[PDB]
Amino acid sequence: GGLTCASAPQGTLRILEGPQQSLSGSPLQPIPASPPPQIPPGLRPRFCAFG
């Protein structure tokens, strides 16, 4: 138990978690565009001129 000074280390291992990327890199999934306003069907001339 003299606890002498040992030599300098050769290198460094570093352990850390890696993320999973099987999900991302996929084609994007955007929010679907709301439709442009379309005229309602069944619009008729309700007003007829008097006389």
Add this chain to the structure above:
Amino acid sequence: MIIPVRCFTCGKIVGNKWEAYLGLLQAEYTEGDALDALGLKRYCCRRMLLAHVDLIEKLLNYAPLEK
């Protein structure tokens, strides 16, 4: 608040048509067809009943006597 007696633009009596309008809409008419079945031909008359917000039923939930 309460349905106007006359239309604002022309003086057509529209105050007697509110309960008829609600009974037509509860009988599954379109709002355009329900305004046709009341004889509201000019769109001045027709917005008076189409756009009416009836605040008196909300304003009578605070009815005081509750008795």
